[PDB]
Design a protein around this ligand. Structure first.
Ligand SMILES: *[C@@H]1O[C@H](CO)[C@@H](O[C@@H]2O[C@H](CO)[C@@H](O[C@@H]3O[C@H](CO[C@@]4(O)O[C@H](CO)[C@@H](O)[C@H](O)[C@@H]4O)[C@@H](O)[C@H](O[C@]4(O)O[C@H](CO)[C@@H](O)[C@H](O)[C@@H]4O)[C@@H]3O)[C@H](O)[C@H]2NC(C)=O)[C@H](O)[C@H]1NC(C)=O
Length: 361
């Protein structure tokens, strides 16, 4: 099984213990580690942060301890305008220029592949995305003639039915990608004025109309559309989504006023790292959706949807049962990487729980 793990560059800036650098990563935890995110300048792949060249080197030295470890550099991301990807892929000339700049950059910095994080292609982009993937892969095939191991090509893809139907030719890109990571943790949050879980595994016979907004539906749908199970990787989150309640009601459908209060370390309204959730739990009431198989907690007027060791193990078993290629984790820097916030002295408790299940078979 593959265990794909993302590391985000901006996590180096969090204060105190929240600060995470590539060397905090256990070389034997994941099979693949993806660095997020690279930029595109003058239609060529480029660094993003001032010290990326140094962090690339730090990350890639983990391979001196685990020679089987593979690293990839992810291009795009949320702070990368989707329109920007749009413009590059739409024109043969700018697309060729970008594709050509990739292999030498990857080789120079010691990466084993490129991850595409175009979030997200729209109806008018579907054809160009296919073109981008095909031609990128052909270039990688060509570059390997030089005697070096062929570069890997992956992509992070929406798990939302409407997003999938609108922007992706799944049957086509599946044949050119080495693996596809499903973003199965964005099924709510988004700004909708009700309380709900962003990463449920199953639909849950209760208050539903989404009926498409759960991991099981997304996986089934991808398989139906033509993606082979052996190229599909299921996304598992290591963060939680928070809400400020509008009333004293805590159960399903409870009214919400806006996102939750920022965490001390991550400092972003609406999100909390798992290590911050471990702290938040002291004094909170914990619950679990029996149908969706995911937990949530409340304290004061704060409501948090998250994943714990039990739900993450549950998701890992599910993907093994569907015979998928593996799991993807977003993100290592949001897991209890120091192993000092969540109690039982274990570094990366969530990611380790997934790895354990995956190693059972
Ligand atoms: C990821 O990559 C993107 C895309 O490459 C980076 O975005 C660009 O960032 C640069 C640096 O801040 C910046 O380019 C500069 O633009 C100057 C003028 O600004 C306009 O830029 O913006 C309006 C937009 O509507 C245009 O209509 C105008 O024509 C300009 O283009 C431009 O003057 C400046 O060019 C200087 O070139 O710099 C040289 C050398 O210092 C100087 O001698 C020249 O006289 C000149 O003034 C420069 O090119 C721009 O704002 C961003 N543009 C784009 C394409 O988005 C992004 O920074 C990067 N991200 C990260 C985090 O690295």
């Amino acid at each position: 099984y593959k265990l794909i793990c993302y590391y985000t560059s901006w996590s180096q800036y969090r204060e105190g213990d929240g600060s995470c650098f590539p060397d905090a990563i256990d070389p034997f935890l994941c099979t693949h580690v993806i660095y997020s995110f690279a930029n595109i300048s003058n239609n060529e792949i480029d660094t993003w942060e001032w010290n990326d060249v140094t962090l690339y080197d730090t990350l890639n030295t983990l391979k001196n301890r685990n020679p089987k470890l593979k690293t990839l550099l992810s291009v795009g991301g949320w702070n990368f305008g989707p329109e920007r990807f749009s413009a590059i892929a739409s024109k043969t000339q700018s697309r060729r220029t970008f594709i050509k700049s990739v292999p030498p950059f990857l080789r120079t910095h010691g990466f084993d592949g490129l991850d595409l994080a175009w979030l997200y292609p729209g109806r008018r982009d579907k054809r160009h995305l296919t073109t981008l993937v095909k031609e990128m892969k052909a270039e990688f095939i060509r570059e390997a003639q030089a005697g070096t191991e062929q570069l890997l090509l992956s992509a992070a893809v929406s798990a939302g039915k409407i997003a999938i139907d609108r922007g992706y030719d799944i049957a086509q890109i599946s044949r050119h990608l080495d693996f596809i990571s499903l973003l199965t943790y964005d099924f709510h949050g988004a700004w909708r004025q009700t309380v709900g879980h962003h990463s449920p595994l199953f639909a849950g016979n209760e208050d539903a109309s989404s009926r498409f907004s759960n991991a099981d539906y997304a996986v089934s749908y991808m398989l139906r559309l033509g993606a082979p199970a052996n190229k599909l990787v299921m996304g598992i989150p290591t963060f939680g989504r928070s809400f400020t309640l509008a009333s004293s009601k805590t159960d399903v459908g409870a009214p919400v006023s806006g996102p939750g209060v920022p965490g001390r370390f991550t400092k972003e309204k609406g999100i909390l790292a798992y290590y911050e959730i471990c702290d938040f739990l002291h004094g909170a009431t914990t619950h679990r959706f029996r149908d969706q198989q995911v937990p949530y907690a409340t304290k004061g007027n704060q409501w948090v949807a998250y994943d714990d060791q039990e739900s993450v193990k549950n998701k890992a078993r599910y993907l093994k049962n569907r015979q998928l290629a593996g799991a993807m984790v977003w993100a290592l820097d949001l897991d209890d990487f120091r192993g000092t916030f969540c109690g039982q002295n274990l570094t990366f408790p969530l990611t380790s729980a997934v790895k354990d299940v995956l190693a059972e078979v």
